[PDB]
């Protein structure tokens, strides 16, 4: 019951002093549950999905690109870089940097990949090329996570991100090999156990990318793969009014459960 689910999302939002942006889409029927679907939210590290999709797209035209070694420096290292800091001095391949940024939310890896592509504007241009007129990447890590009230930098809408996740992981925005690699990376994410993954039935597989930012911002985007039915896209953006808010996992899990029940 889409209308019942949307009411429950409104009730969930009433429990905290912030905003919930949500879209769930059953890709077979197009059944769609949304809350604040056309409002902008700070996407934080969920942008790393669009970044790596852009890298994969480049690799379709440069066969050796994913195996190229990037010999980055200690001076490139910034906070929340659990893979790149361990391997500095040996370097990492482009594929390994994508895996790190997607599965561990590695910030240095994202900056290296942004630089490889030519800057944050190339990620925005990639989004436009797949039909997303809304996503905008304005800054690099870590400043893209400031999540300031009313700031449109480094934002998208839940609706635009739902369409982009659909086209990238389920549809044909990427070639088959690139779609499979993006899925494989996101299926292996390590940072989302308490978010979308905590709100779905035990037999659903999940490909997701989380984000956490200032103003208690807590996001998760991805696709659930139930057995014997089509994939379901889940987009969850949350951001709080208190600059001193502590980011939570439980609102995302609760919003996910609402939609999972509706799509039972
Ligand atoms: B990013 O948004 O992804 C990310 C997550 C995530 O995937 O949920 C968790 C932890 C770090 C990161 C890196 C990216 N975010 C930031 O760099 C901003 C940073 C995240 C940690 C917060 N810590 C507050 C005090 N416990 C503050 C902002």
The technique by which this structure was obtained is X-ray
Phi and psi at 81, nearest 5°, equal -135, 65
Distance CA 139, CA 143 (A): 6
**Alpha-carbon span 55 to 12, nearest angstrom:** 36
Q: Element (H or E) spanning 84, and its range?
A: helix 84-87
Distance CA 196, CA 219 (A): 9
Coil vs helix vs strand at 190: coil
The yes-or-no answer on residue 45 being catalytic is yes
Taking CA atoms only, the protein residue closest to ligand 1 atom 16 is 213
Q: Phi and psi of 47, rounded to 5°?
A: -60, -20
Instruction: Pull the structure tokens for residue 199.
Output: 């709100």
Whole-number Å distance between alpha carbons of 92 and 90: 7
> Cα separation of 131 and 133, whole Å?
6
Which residues have C-beta within 8 Å of that of residue 70, sequence separation ≥ 6?
A: 91, 92, 93, 94, 97, 112, 116
Q: By alpha-carbon position, which residue is closest to atom 18 of ligand 1?
A: 213
Identify whether the C-beta of residue 20 lies closer than 8 Å to the C-beta of residue 4.
no
**Of 232, 234, 205, 231, nearest in space to 219 by CA:** 234
Instruction: Specify which residues 222 forms β-bridges with.
Output: 208, 234
Dihedral (Cα; 119, 123, 129, 130), 10-degree rounding: 170
- 4 alpha carbon to ligand 1 midpoint, in Å? 33
Sign, CA dihedral 201-204-205-211, equals negative
Residue environment code for 141-155, b if the CB has 16+ CB neighbours within 10 A, otherwise e: bbebbbbeeeeeebb
CA angle 195, 210, 33 (to 5 degrees): 65
Report yes or no: 241 and 180 within 8 Å, Cβ to Cβ: no
Radius of gyration of the chain (CA): 17
Using CA atoms, how far apart are residues 176 and 233, in angstroms rounded to an integer?
19
Place of tokens 């790149």: 84
Which of the four CATH numbers 3.40.50.300, 3.40.710.10, 3.30.530.20, 3.20.20.70 does domain 2-262 have? 3.40.710.10
Instruction: Kindly provide the resolution of this structure in angstroms, with one decimal.
Output: 1.2
Tell me, using a 6 A CB cutoff, whether residue 37 lines ligand 1: no
Pairing of strands 69-70, 92-93: antiparallel
β-bridge partners, 26:
232
DSSP run (H or E) holding 22: strand 18-26
Q: Longest C-alpha distance within the chain, in Å?
A: 54
Any ligand 1 atom below 6 A from CB of 213: yes
Q: How far apart (Å, rounded) are the C-alpha atoms in residues 161 and 250? A: 21
| Tokens encoding 117 | 């592509």
Closest among 42, 53, 71 to 185, alpha carbons compared: 53
Task: Tell me how crowded residue 119 is: count the other CB atoms within 10 A of its CB.
Answer: 13
How far is C-alpha 162 from the geometric centre of its chain's CA atoms? Answer: 10
Two tokens, residue 104: 């561990």
């Amino acid at each position: 019951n889409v209308a019942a689910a949307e009411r429950q999302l409104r009730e969930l939002e009433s429990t905290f002093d912030g905003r919930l942006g949500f879209v769930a889409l059953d890709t077979a029927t197009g059944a769609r549950i949304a809350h604040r679907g056309d409002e902008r939210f700070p996407f934080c590290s969920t942008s790393k999905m669009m970044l790596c999709a852009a890298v994969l797209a480049r690799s379709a035209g440069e066969p050796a690109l994913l195996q190229r070694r990037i010999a980055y420096a200690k001076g490139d290292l910034i906070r929340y870089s659990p893979i790149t800091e361990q391997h500095v001095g040996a370097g990492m391949s482009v594929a390994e940097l994508c895996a790190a940024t997607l599965q561990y939310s590695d910030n240095t890896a994202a900056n290296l990949l942004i630089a490889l592509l030519g800057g944050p504007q190339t990620v925005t241009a990639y989004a436009r090329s797949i039909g997303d007129a809304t996503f905008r990447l304005d800054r690099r890590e870590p400043e893209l996570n400031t999540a300031l009230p009313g700031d449109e930098r480094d934002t998208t809408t839940p609706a635009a991100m739902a369409a982009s996740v659909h086209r990238l992981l389920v549809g044909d925005a990427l070639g088959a090999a690139q779609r499979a690699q993006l899925n494989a990376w996101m299926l292996g994410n390590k940072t989302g156990d308490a978010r979308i993954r905590a709100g779905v039935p035990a037999d659903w597989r999940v490909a997701d990318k989380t984000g956490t930012g200032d103003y208690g911002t807590a996001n998760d985007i991805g696709v659930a793969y139930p057995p014997n039915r089509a994939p379901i896209v889940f987009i969850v953006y949350t951001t709080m009014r208190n600059p001193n808010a502590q980011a939570r996992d439980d609102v995302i899990a609760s919003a996910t459960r609402i939609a999972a029940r509706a799509f039972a």
